[PDB]
Coordinates of all heavy atoms in Angstrom, one line a residue:
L516 N -17.9 -68.4 -63.2 CA -17.2 -67.5 -64.0 C -17.9 -66.0 -64.0 O -17.2 -65.0 -63.9 CB -17.0 -67.9 -65.4 CG -16.0 -69.1 -65.6 CD1 -16.2 -69.8 -66.9 CD2 -14.5 -68.5 -65.6
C517 N -19.2 -66.0 -64.2 CA -20.0 -64.7 -64.1 C -19.7 -64.1 -62.7 O -19.5 -62.8 -62.5 CB -21.4 -64.9 -64.3 SG -21.8 -65.2 -66.1
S518 N -19.7 -64.9 -61.6 CA -19.5 -64.4 -60.2 C -18.1 -63.8 -60.1 O -17.9 -62.7 -59.5 CB -19.6 -65.5 -59.2 OG -19.4 -65.0 -57.9
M519 N -17.1 -64.4 -60.8 CA -15.7 -63.8 -60.8 C -15.6 -62.5 -61.6 O -15.0 -61.6 -61.2 CB -14.7 -64.8 -61.4 CG -14.4 -65.9 -60.4 SD -13.4 -67.2 -61.3 CE -11.9 -66.3 -61.6
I520 N -16.2 -62.5 -62.7 CA -16.3 -61.2 -63.5 C -17.0 -60.1 -62.6 O -16.5 -58.9 -62.6 CB -17.0 -61.3 -64.8 CG1 -16.2 -62.3 -65.8 CG2 -17.2 -60.0 -65.4 CD1 -17.0 -62.6 -67.1
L521 N -18.1 -60.4 -61.9 CA -18.9 -59.4 -61.2 C -18.0 -59.0 -60.0 O -18.0 -57.8 -59.7 CB -20.2 -60.0 -60.7 CG -21.1 -59.1 -59.9 CD1 -21.4 -57.9 -60.6 CD2 -22.4 -59.8 -59.5
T522 N -17.2 -59.9 -59.4 CA -16.3 -59.5 -58.2 C -15.2 -58.5 -58.8 O -15.0 -57.4 -58.1 CB -15.6 -60.8 -57.6 OG1 -16.6 -61.5 -57.0 CG2 -14.5 -60.4 -56.6
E523 N -14.7 -58.7 -60.0 CA -13.7 -57.8 -60.5 C -14.4 -56.4 -60.9 O -13.7 -55.4 -60.7 CB -13.1 -58.4 -61.8 CG -12.3 -59.7 -61.4 CD -11.9 -60.6 -62.6 OE1 -12.2 -60.4 -63.7 OE2 -11.3 -61.7 -62.3
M524 N -15.6 -56.4 -61.3 CA -16.3 -55.1 -61.6 C -16.6 -54.4 -60.2 O -16.3 -53.2 -60.1 CB -17.6 -55.4 -62.5 CG -17.0 -55.4 -64.2 SD -18.5 -55.3 -64.9 CE -19.6 -56.6 -64.1
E525 N -17.0 -55.2 -59.1 CA -17.3 -54.6 -57.8 C -16.0 -53.9 -57.2 O -16.2 -53.0 -56.4 CB -17.8 -55.7 -56.9 CG -19.3 -56.2 -57.2 CD -19.6 -57.5 -56.5 OE1 -18.8 -58.3 -56.2 OE2 -20.8 -57.8 -56.3
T526 N -14.8 -54.4 -57.4 CA -13.6 -54.0 -56.8 C -12.9 -52.9 -57.7 O -11.9 -52.4 -57.2 CB -12.7 -55.2 -56.4 OG1 -12.5 -56.0 -57.6 CG2 -13.4 -56.1 -55.5
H527 N -13.3 -52.7 -58.9 CA -12.7 -51.6 -59.7 C -12.9 -50.2 -59.1 O -14.0 -49.9 -58.5 CB -13.4 -51.6 -61.1 CG -12.7 -50.8 -62.2 ND1 -12.6 -49.5 -62.2 CD2 -12.3 -51.2 -63.5 CE1 -12.1 -49.0 -63.3 NE2 -11.9 -50.0 -64.1
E528 N -11.9 -49.4 -59.1 CA -12.0 -48.1 -58.5 C -13.0 -47.2 -59.0 O -13.5 -46.3 -58.3 CB -10.6 -47.4 -58.3 CG -10.0 -46.9 -59.5 CD -8.8 -45.8 -59.2 OE1 -9.2 -44.7 -58.9 OE2 -7.6 -46.1 -59.4
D529 N -13.5 -47.4 -60.2 CA -14.5 -46.6 -60.8 C -16.0 -47.2 -60.7 O -16.9 -46.8 -61.4 CB -14.4 -46.2 -62.3 CG -13.0 -45.4 -62.6 OD1 -12.5 -44.8 -61.6 OD2 -12.5 -45.5 -63.8
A530 N -16.1 -48.2 -59.9 CA -17.4 -48.9 -59.7 C -18.4 -48.1 -58.8 O -19.6 -48.4 -58.8 CB -17.2 -50.3 -59.1
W531 N -17.9 -47.1 -58.1 CA -18.7 -46.4 -57.0 C -20.0 -45.9 -57.5 O -21.0 -45.9 -56.7 CB -17.9 -45.3 -56.3 CG -17.3 -44.3 -57.2 CD1 -16.1 -44.3 -57.8 CD2 -18.0 -43.1 -57.7 NE1 -15.9 -43.2 -58.6 CE2 -17.1 -42.4 -58.6 CE3 -19.2 -42.4 -57.4 CZ2 -17.3 -41.2 -59.2 CZ3 -19.5 -41.2 -58.1 CH2 -18.6 -40.6 -59.0
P532 N -20.2 -45.4 -58.7 CA -21.6 -45.0 -59.1 C -22.6 -46.1 -59.3 O -23.8 -45.8 -59.4 CB -21.4 -44.2 -60.5 CG -19.9 -44.0 -60.6 CD -19.3 -45.1 -59.9
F533 N -22.1 -47.3 -59.3 CA -22.8 -48.6 -59.8 C -23.0 -49.6 -58.7 O -23.7 -50.6 -58.9 CB -22.2 -49.2 -61.0 CG -21.8 -48.2 -62.1 CD1 -20.5 -47.9 -62.4 CD2 -22.8 -47.4 -62.6 CE1 -20.2 -46.9 -63.3 CE2 -22.5 -46.3 -63.5 CZ -21.2 -46.1 -63.9
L534 N -22.5 -49.4 -57.5 CA -22.5 -50.4 -56.4 C -23.9 -50.7 -55.8 O -24.2 -51.8 -55.5 CB -21.5 -50.1 -55.3 CG -20.0 -50.0 -55.7 CD1 -19.1 -49.6 -54.5 CD2 -19.6 -51.4 -56.2
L535 N -24.7 -49.6 -55.8 CA -26.0 -49.6 -55.1 C -27.0 -49.0 -56.0 O -26.7 -48.2 -56.9 CB -25.9 -48.9 -53.7 CG -25.0 -49.5 -52.7 CD1 -25.1 -48.6 -51.4 CD2 -25.4 -50.9 -52.3
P536 N -28.3 -49.4 -55.8 CA -29.4 -48.8 -56.6 C -29.4 -47.2 -56.4 O -29.1 -46.7 -55.3 CB -30.7 -49.3 -56.0 CG -30.3 -50.3 -55.1 CD -28.9 -50.3 -54.7
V537 N -29.6 -46.5 -57.5 CA -29.8 -45.0 -57.5 C -31.0 -44.8 -56.5 O -32.0 -45.5 -56.6 CB -30.1 -44.5 -58.8 CG1 -30.3 -42.9 -58.8 CG2 -28.8 -44.6 -59.7
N538 N -30.9 -43.8 -55.6 CA -32.0 -43.5 -54.6 C -33.1 -42.7 -55.4 O -32.9 -41.5 -55.7 CB -31.4 -42.7 -53.4 CG -32.5 -42.5 -52.3 OD1 -33.7 -42.4 -52.6 ND2 -32.0 -42.5 -51.1
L539 N -34.2 -43.3 -55.7 CA -35.3 -42.8 -56.5 C -36.0 -41.6 -55.7 O -36.7 -40.8 -56.4 CB -36.3 -43.8 -56.9 CG -35.7 -45.0 -57.8 CD1 -36.7 -46.0 -58.2 CD2 -34.9 -44.3 -59.0
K540 N -35.9 -41.6 -54.4 CA -36.5 -40.4 -53.6 C -35.6 -39.2 -53.7 O -36.1 -38.1 -53.7 CB -36.6 -40.8 -52.1 CG -37.5 -41.9 -51.8 CD -37.3 -42.2 -50.3 CE -37.9 -43.6 -49.8 NZ -39.4 -43.6 -50.0
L541 N -34.2 -39.4 -53.9 CA -33.3 -38.3 -53.7 C -32.7 -37.8 -55.0 O -32.0 -36.9 -55.0 CB -32.2 -38.6 -52.8 CG -32.6 -39.0 -51.4 CD1 -31.4 -39.2 -50.5 CD2 -33.6 -37.9 -50.7
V542 N -33.0 -38.5 -56.2 CA -32.4 -38.1 -57.5 C -33.6 -37.8 -58.4 O -34.2 -38.6 -59.0 CB -31.5 -39.1 -58.1 CG1 -30.9 -38.8 -59.4 CG2 -30.3 -39.4 -57.1
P543 N -33.9 -36.5 -58.5 CA -34.9 -36.0 -59.4 C -34.7 -36.5 -60.8 O -33.6 -36.4 -61.4 CB -34.8 -34.4 -59.3 CG -34.5 -34.2 -57.8 CD -33.5 -35.4 -57.5
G544 N -35.8 -36.9 -61.4 CA -35.9 -37.3 -62.8 C -35.6 -38.8 -63.0 O -36.1 -39.4 -64.0
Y545 N -34.9 -39.4 -62.0 CA -34.4 -40.9 -62.3 C -35.5 -41.9 -62.5 O -35.5 -42.7 -63.5 CB -33.5 -41.3 -61.2 CG -32.5 -42.4 -61.8 CD1 -31.3 -41.9 -62.5 CD2 -32.7 -43.7 -61.7 CE1 -30.4 -42.9 -63.1 CE2 -31.8 -44.7 -62.2 CZ -30.6 -44.3 -62.9 OH -29.8 -45.2 -63.5
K546 N -36.5 -41.8 -61.6 CA -37.6 -42.7 -61.6 C -38.4 -42.7 -62.9 O -38.7 -43.7 -63.5 CB -38.6 -42.5 -60.4 CG -39.6 -43.6 -60.2 CD -40.3 -43.4 -58.8 CE -40.9 -44.7 -58.3 NZ -42.0 -45.3 -59.2
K547 N -38.7 -41.5 -63.4 CA -39.5 -41.4 -64.6 C -38.7 -41.7 -65.9 O -39.2 -42.2 -66.9 CB -40.1 -39.9 -64.7 CG -41.0 -39.6 -65.9 CD -42.3 -40.4 -65.8 CE -43.2 -40.2 -67.0 NZ -44.0 -39.1 -66.7
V548 N -37.5 -41.3 -65.9 CA -36.7 -41.4 -67.1 C -36.1 -42.8 -67.3 O -36.1 -43.3 -68.5 CB -35.5 -40.4 -67.1 CG1 -34.5 -40.6 -68.2 CG2 -36.1 -39.0 -67.2
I549 N -35.7 -43.5 -66.2 CA -34.9 -44.8 -66.3 C -35.9 -45.9 -66.0 O -36.2 -46.1 -64.9 CB -33.7 -44.8 -65.4 CG1 -32.8 -43.7 -65.8 CG2 -33.0 -46.2 -65.5 CD1 -32.1 -43.8 -67.1
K550 N -36.4 -46.5 -67.1 CA -37.5 -47.4 -66.9 C -37.1 -48.7 -66.2 O -38.0 -49.3 -65.5 CB -38.1 -47.8 -68.3 CG -38.6 -46.6 -69.2 CD -39.5 -45.7 -68.4 CE -40.0 -44.5 -69.2 NZ -41.0 -43.7 -68.3
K551 N -35.9 -49.2 -66.4 CA -35.4 -50.4 -65.7 C -34.1 -50.1 -65.0 O -33.0 -50.4 -65.6 CB -35.2 -51.4 -66.8 CG -36.6 -51.8 -67.4 CD -36.4 -52.8 -68.5 CE -35.8 -54.2 -68.1 NZ -35.8 -55.2 -69.1
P552 N -34.1 -49.6 -63.7 CA -32.9 -49.3 -63.0 C -32.1 -50.7 -62.7 O -32.8 -51.7 -62.6 CB -33.4 -48.8 -61.6 CG -34.8 -48.3 -62.0 CD -35.3 -49.1 -63.1
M553 N -30.8 -50.6 -62.8 CA -30.0 -51.8 -62.5 C -28.7 -51.4 -61.8 O -28.2 -50.2 -62.2 CB -29.9 -52.7 -63.7 CG -29.2 -54.0 -63.5 SD -29.9 -55.0 -62.2 CE -31.6 -55.1 -62.8
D554 N -28.1 -52.2 -60.9 CA -26.9 -51.8 -60.3 C -26.2 -53.2 -59.9 O -26.8 -54.3 -59.9 CB -27.1 -51.0 -59.0 CG -27.8 -51.8 -57.9 OD1 -29.0 -52.0 -58.0 OD2 -27.0 -52.2 -57.0
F555 N -24.9 -53.1 -59.5 CA -24.1 -54.3 -59.2 C -24.7 -55.1 -58.1 O -24.6 -56.4 -58.1 CB -22.6 -54.0 -59.0 CG -21.9 -53.4 -60.2 CD1 -20.6 -52.8 -60.0 CD2 -22.4 -53.5 -61.5 CE1 -20.0 -52.2 -61.1 CE2 -21.7 -53.0 -62.6 CZ -20.5 -52.3 -62.4
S556 N -25.1 -54.5 -57.0 CA -25.7 -55.2 -55.8 C -27.0 -56.0 -56.2 O -27.1 -57.2 -55.7 CB -26.0 -54.3 -54.6 OG -27.2 -53.5 -54.8
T557 N -27.8 -55.5 -57.1 CA -29.0 -56.1 -57.6 C -28.6 -57.3 -58.5 O -29.1 -58.5 -58.3 CB -29.9 -55.1 -58.3 OG1 -30.3 -54.1 -57.3 CG2 -31.2 -55.8 -58.8
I558 N -27.6 -57.1 -59.3 CA -27.1 -58.2 -60.1 C -26.5 -59.3 -59.2 O -26.8 -60.6 -59.5 CB -26.0 -57.8 -61.2 CG1 -26.6 -56.7 -62.1 CG2 -25.4 -58.9 -61.9 CD1 -25.6 -56.0 -63.0
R559 N -25.8 -58.9 -58.2 CA -25.2 -59.9 -57.3 C -26.3 -60.7 -56.6 O -26.2 -62.0 -56.5 CB -24.3 -59.3 -56.3 CG -23.7 -60.1 -55.1 CD -22.8 -61.2 -55.6 NE -21.5 -60.7 -56.0 CZ -20.6 -61.4 -56.7 NH1 -20.8 -62.7 -57.0 NH2 -19.4 -60.9 -57.0

């Protein structure tokens, strides 16, 4: 059932900011500010 919920989150049209980990080399400030990065691919 968690797998099904996660599939539904993955296919939502607004999921695009969350599909992959934030690129810590290319997004200034992210690494220092966000102590525990998480994204849908990492949860999957």
